[PDB]
Design a protein around this ligand. Structure first.
Ligand SMILES: CCCCCCCC/C=C\CCCCCCCC(=O)O[C@@H](COC(=O)CCCCCCCCCCCCCCC)COP(=O)([O-])OCC[N+](C)(C)C
Ligand SMILES: *[C@@H]1O[C@H](CO)[C@@H](O)[C@H](O)[C@H]1NC(C)=O
Lengths: 51, 87
């Protein structure tokens, strides 16, 4: 647990909490991530988001 | 190392040799088997326990001056300051 300093192990662990909250906001905000499920029934306004 | 408890250190100096200077440190001591109020350095020393952590050598090799510095041991708790404890 030594080859990175204990402020880097905190900056990595805050980056996982950082980026995943950034990725969740953008995925719900972006209109192209909202794909349409049920390709067998391609007529319904039930577009979903997997994030 | 004197034998009695009394010494008569002098200094002679001529008018020309006036800038000659010295600075010493006399230390009281007793026989080897020390007690309370006495710390034991080896080779015939019973220096006072005040002389431990006096900041000066009152013996040989600095034995009275050791294990006398204690601040903190930490990791990122050591740097909760203008270092990365702000970031
Ligand atoms: C929605 C909002 C999104 C943003 C936030 C999302 C959350 C992100 C998740 C987690 C947060 C990010 C990492 C964790 C914490 C930072 C760690 C760190 O050390 O600081 C780092 C950055 O921070 C700085 O120190 C400022 C540096 C100025 C330039 C930074 C670029 C940002 C602007 C963008 C420019 C536009 C580019 C456009 C395209 C070209 C670097 O620190 P340092 O200063 O290098 O260290 C000093 C070195 N020293 C000690 C030897 C002196
Ligand atoms: C020597 O003895 C005491 C320890 O009992 C020490 O604290 C003190 O500074 C010294 N006193 C004198 C009079 O030298």
């Amino acid at each position: 647990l030594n080859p990175l300093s204990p402020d880097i192990w905190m900056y990595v662990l805050l980056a996982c909490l950082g980026v995943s909250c950034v990725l969740f906001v953008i995925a719900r905000f972006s209109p192209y991530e909202w794909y349409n499920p049920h390709p067998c029934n391609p007529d319904s306004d039930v577009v979903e988001n997997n994030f | 190392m004197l034998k009695t408890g009394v010494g008569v250190i002098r200094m002679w100096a001529d008018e020309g040799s006036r800038l000659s200077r010295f600075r010493m440190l006399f230390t009281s001591f007793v026989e080897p088997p020390c007690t309370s109020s006495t710390f034991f350095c080896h080779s015939n020393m019973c220096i006072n326990n005040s002389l431990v952590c006096n900041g000066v050598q009152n013996c040989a090799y600095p034995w009275d001056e050791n294990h006398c510095k204690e601040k903190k041991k930490a990791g990122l708790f050591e740097q909760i300051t203008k270092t990365h404890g702000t970031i």
